[PDB]
Amino acid sequence: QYLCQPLLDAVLANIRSPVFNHSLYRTFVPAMTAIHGPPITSIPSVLQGEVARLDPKFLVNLDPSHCSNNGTVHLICKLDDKDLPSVPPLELSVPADYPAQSPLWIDRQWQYDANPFLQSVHRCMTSRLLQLPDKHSVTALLNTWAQSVHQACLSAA
């Protein structure tokens, strides 16, 4: 910073030299070692952390069909609630690298037929899921699937 440019200029002059480690040795070694003293004497862990704090009211497990040990995964959900009636079990679709991507869900229109209650459930699904934000976790979709059953049961009752 002030009066150190001989030390700075010596190393740039002595750089790209093969005798560098020996030139510095020859010019420097006896000065410090004399006075100052002598020398001394399967599944990724993302889903494993995801399912850890999932609700016990879901019993989601893997799909028995489709491919396995690959990038894309599918989880079929089980709902055991005494409050809510029976519905189709629903199945998701999550590709590889589950963080920072937006997954999908299967489509089967005829499974929710023979009852306008199931059609209202499907319409509520198309209402709630279309405004869900990007890159969200599976808890948001699971809970929006869970609340719509009560939201349709109150209209049915």
Partner 1 sequence: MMDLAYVCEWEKWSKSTHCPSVPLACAWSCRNLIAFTMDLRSDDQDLTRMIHILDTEHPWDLHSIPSEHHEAITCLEWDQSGSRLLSADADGQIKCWSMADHLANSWESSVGSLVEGDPIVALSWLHNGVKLALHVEKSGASSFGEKFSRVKFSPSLTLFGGKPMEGWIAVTVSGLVTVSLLKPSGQVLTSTESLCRLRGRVALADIAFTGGGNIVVATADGSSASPVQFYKVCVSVVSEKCRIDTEILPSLFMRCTTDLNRKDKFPAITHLKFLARDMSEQVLLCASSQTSSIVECWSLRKETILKWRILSATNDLDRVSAVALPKLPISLTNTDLKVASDTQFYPGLGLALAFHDGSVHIVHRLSLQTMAVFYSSVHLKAMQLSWTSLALVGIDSHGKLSVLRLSPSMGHPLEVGLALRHLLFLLEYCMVTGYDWWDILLHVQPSMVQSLVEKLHEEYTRQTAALQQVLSTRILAMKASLCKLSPCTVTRVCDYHTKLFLIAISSTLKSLLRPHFLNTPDKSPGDRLTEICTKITDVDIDKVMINLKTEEFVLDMNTLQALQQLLQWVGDFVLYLLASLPNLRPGHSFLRDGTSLGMLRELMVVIRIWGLLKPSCLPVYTATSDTQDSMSLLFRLLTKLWICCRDEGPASEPDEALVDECCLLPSQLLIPSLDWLPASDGLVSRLQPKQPLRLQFGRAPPKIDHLRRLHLGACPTEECKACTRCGCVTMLKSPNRTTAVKQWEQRWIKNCL
Q: Specify the residue for token string 């079929």.
A: 76
Name which of 21 and 115 has its Cβ closer to partner 1.
Answer: 21
* CB of residue 130 to partner 1, shortest distance in Å: 49
| Of 109, 114, 101, 102, residue with least CA distance to 125 | 109
- Cα separation, 104 vs 99, in Å, equals 13
Phi, psi of 99 (to 5 degrees): -65, 150
* CB of residue 18 to partner 1, shortest distance in Å: 3
Name which of 7 and 34 has its Cβ closer to partner 1.
Answer: 34
* CB of residue 67 to partner 1, shortest distance in Å: 24
Element (H, E) at 47: helix 45-50
What is the three-class DSSP state of 79?
Answer: strand
* CB of residue 30 to partner 1, shortest distance in Å: 7
Q: Say how far residue 102 (Cα) sits from the centre of its chain.
A: 12
Name which of 16 and 82 has its Cβ closer to partner 1.
Answer: 16
Q: What angle do CA 102, 92, 59 make, to 5 degrees?
A: 125
What is the three-class DSSP state of 17?
Answer: coil
* CB of residue 28 to partner 1, shortest distance in Å: 11
Sketch the per residue contact string, 4 through 43, with partner 1: x for CB under 8 A, - otherwise: --------------xx-xx--x----x-------------
Touching partner 1, residues 85-124 (CB under 8 A): none
Residue numbers at the binding site for partner 1 (CB under 8 A): 18-19, 21-22, 25, 30
